Amino acid sequence: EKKKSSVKAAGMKSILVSENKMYITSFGKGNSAVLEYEVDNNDYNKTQLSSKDNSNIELGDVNEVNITFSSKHGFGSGVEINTSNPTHRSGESSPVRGDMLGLKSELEKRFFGKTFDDNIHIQLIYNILDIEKILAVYVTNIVYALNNMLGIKDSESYDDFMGYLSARNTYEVFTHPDKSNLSDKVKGNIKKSLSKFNDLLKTKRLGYFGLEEPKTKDTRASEAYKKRVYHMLAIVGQIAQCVFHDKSGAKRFDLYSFINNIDPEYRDTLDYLVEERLKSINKDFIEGNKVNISLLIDMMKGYEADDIIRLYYDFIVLKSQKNLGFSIKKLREKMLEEYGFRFKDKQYDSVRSKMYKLMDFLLFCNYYRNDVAAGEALVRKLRFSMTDDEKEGIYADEAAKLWGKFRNDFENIADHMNGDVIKELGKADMDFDEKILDSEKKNASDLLYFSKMIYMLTYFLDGKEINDLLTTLISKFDNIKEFLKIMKSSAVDVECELTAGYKLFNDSQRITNELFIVKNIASMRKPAASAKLTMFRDALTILGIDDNITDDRISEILKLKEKGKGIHGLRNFITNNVIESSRFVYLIKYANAQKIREVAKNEKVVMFVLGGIPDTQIERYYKSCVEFPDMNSSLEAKRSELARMIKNISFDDFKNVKQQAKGRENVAKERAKAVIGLYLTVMYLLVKNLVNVNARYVIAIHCLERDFGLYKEIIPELASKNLKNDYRILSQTLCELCDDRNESSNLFLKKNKRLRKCVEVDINNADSSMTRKYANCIAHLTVVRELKEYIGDIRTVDSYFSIYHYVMQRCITKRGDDTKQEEKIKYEDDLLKNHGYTKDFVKALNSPFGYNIPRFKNLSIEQLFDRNEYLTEK
RNA sequence: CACUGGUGCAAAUUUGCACUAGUCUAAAACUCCUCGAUUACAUACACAAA
Ligand SMILES: [Mg+2]
Ligand SMILES: [Mg+2]
């Protein structure tokens, strides 16, 4: 069983090191740090900074090698914990640890204007680098999705569209480049992007993102919509220019300041988008939430109605229940599993979300207002826990106490969870003034432009993508705010003036809070799109249709241009089950409907995805999708059956479905919905996993360009080098320096001669041409684009990593039909014979990333790649 | 099945293993928030309708 660090469990958050002192911190609420002690490195004298009430740990003996301490709150019944004194390292003169890359001094100069004899500034800086790494993944995906949206399947060019946009050009300059005072090359570049912009508008595919063109054809409304879309694309392009380098090796330095420095029209667009979302939630919130609010007021006897309304607004928009230090949902889930299993019954499926909100709200109020001490006690037990099993036990014990307290309340909620009561509560008068929430309401004016810019990015993202980007940004800003607070403390008091480009980080507290709200509002369902003919073609094509069907034929089959009563059942069925599916939208955004349908014919690929689905879920899918299920068949037979259904699905299968189903018609309709849902889920899982694998490589490219720029300032040997000429130059130069010199900036290569020698072999196996192709394929999501072309050639489909590398290797070794015979790569012959990726080829391709050994090994060895795989063998 | 530090056995000129840490390693510091993830998520029961 994996065990946690006892040092973290006991309460020691961090040991900050300066040249003469160490500062020990303990965990406060959430990410807060409690300064506990200051220790002198030379004489080991200690001074307690914490008050008797605030202190969480007791410091014992401190010496050159070890630090002994114990919890003041009972961890391990007060057991003594021994941790290394961080200043004790052989072969290092300084008490202060350096970074593995050796870029700590260059980074401190870039962010703070000078070097420091402490390890605090570098920790804050690594948090900023993490923000850039995650933005690099999402902008790369968004740019690919926008290009993909065009439908130009055969196209050498890529960034003629997003690459030529600039946030420094207003909409007027963009639409009238000639009337500009810009260079002729620039004017032509703008025209190329303008033409692509009109191409994107013509597709009608922007509706997938919630960017619907206006219903009216009025010129004024049309231009206002186009201007907003242009601002969104130009901002995405600007972010891309800040996290990736251009042809000349240059990148913009205004990522954190540009939004406040560009034309005010861009800021108007950001306000318009956020105001639209906030105004829909905020307008008549009490009337909009009257059913739950009425039930809660009747149920919560110890609270004033106005207080409940304010708490409910918090629960929906602020989601304070998600900042408690434990999972409210997990507690509710444990309560239902052990004691309220009846509420998990099929009859509550239609009202389950409402029922869970009411149950979660009671638990939230219990810990947020009524029993804050119980919440603090629960966090301490979870922090003290050393294993996953212990943590589950803590949630289970808490659920048992909660059931005794809320059993009657939960039964009461379940009694009201039916259509008759809900319809009744909906029609009932709600005499509460909407102005009660004026003090709690969140408005667009309350947020920074940086926060609004992040909200704008969410239009292009799926809920999982929003969760991944936002939770990562929130965590990094929270860490940065804490590091600044520690450095500015009376006890530490070290200079930390950020340079002009990074002044935004001074507002890291406010940004962390605003970003949390952005995650909540961005995660909410947007109004359904007006389905356009393009979407209907996408839906019929993904299901399976004649390759040469005309737009007029699609209109005819779905009666799109026909007016009448009850004649649109098929159109409505396709809209509800395909067009409105987030899984379908994800597939159209990153893939091609016709290509995905062809990939679905490959039973080995579909069986691989089905294999990952839990056995209980396969049984549910088998029962819902198969008309006459053989329940006595094996799980492999059931998976094999579902794979055959997916291979044979077509639009034709659903042409007679009855959308307004009566009686027995319902059985066929439910089965059709189940089959479409499984088909979309299986294809979505495959594409999403490949996009996710690609993201790891995108981080590697972003880091290599960033690291090359930093190393270039301190390595004379890199002085005349251009990275794009040969991507292997950083690893090659650093490996050579380790062999020929004594001093080394890069510790990964210097410390591990065996791994350094391995990287040297991998560099030699590669060349400038193949590495350049790899970087281009990673940046353009070529593996996802060309998946249908090569996935069929894989003999055994056993991992996302192996699928990605096989397709990538086929793309790299493809001999251009337009170009002449080029230096055939030495791995091509075996790859074509093997029908599987070549392990040595991955290492050669990844040789540019060799300077960061953990990244290089994780990206080159299938067993080390995924943190969620090989848990038992790990 | 990683990387780096400390400690402890071993080991000449390769280092290896064990225990333990690390926000200054890797998508990677505790509790959260997340992801894996499919069972779904989502200010408005569901269904139908526009
Ligand atoms: Mg030393
Ligand atoms: Mg880190």
Author numbering: 49 to 922
What does the article say, verbatim?
Cas13d is a class 2 type VI-D CRISPR-Cas RNA-guided RNase. Cas13 family is the only family of class 2 Cas enzymes known to exclusively target single-stranded RNA. Analogously to the other members of the Cas13 superfamily, Cas13d also contains two R-X4-H HEPN motifs, but bears little overall similarity to the amino acid sequences of Cas13a and Cas13b. Owing to its biochemical properties, especially small size, lack of constraints on the target flanking sequences, and highly efficient and specific target RNA cleavage, Cas13d is a promising candidate for RNA engineering and editing.
The binary complex was obtained by the selenomethionine (SeMet)-derived UrCas13d (R288A/R823A) mutant co-expressed with CRISPR RNA in vivo. The SeMet-labeled structure was subsequently used as a model to solve the crystal structure of the unlabeled UrCas13d (R288A/R823A) binary complex at 1.86 Å resolution using the molecular replacement method. A mature 50-nt crRNA was determined in the binary complex. It originated from an in vivo transcript encoded by a co-expressed CRISPR template, which was further processed by UrCas13d itself in E. coli cells. The crRNA consists of a 30-nt repeat region (C(-30)-C(-1)) and 20-nt spacer region (U(1)-A(20)). The high resolution of the binary complex unambiguously shows an octahedral-shaped electron density around the phosphate group of the nucleotide C(-7). Considering that Mg2+ and Na+ are metal ions provided in buffer systems during the purification and crystallization, a penta-hydrated Mg2+ was built into the present structure. Moreover, the (Mg(H2O)5)2+ ion forms hydrogen bonds with the phosphate groups of the nucleotides A(-5), A(-3), and A(-2), as well as the side chain of residue D178. In addition, a tetra-hydrated Mg2+ was found to coordinate with two backbone oxygen atoms of residues R137 and E140 from a loop region of NTD.
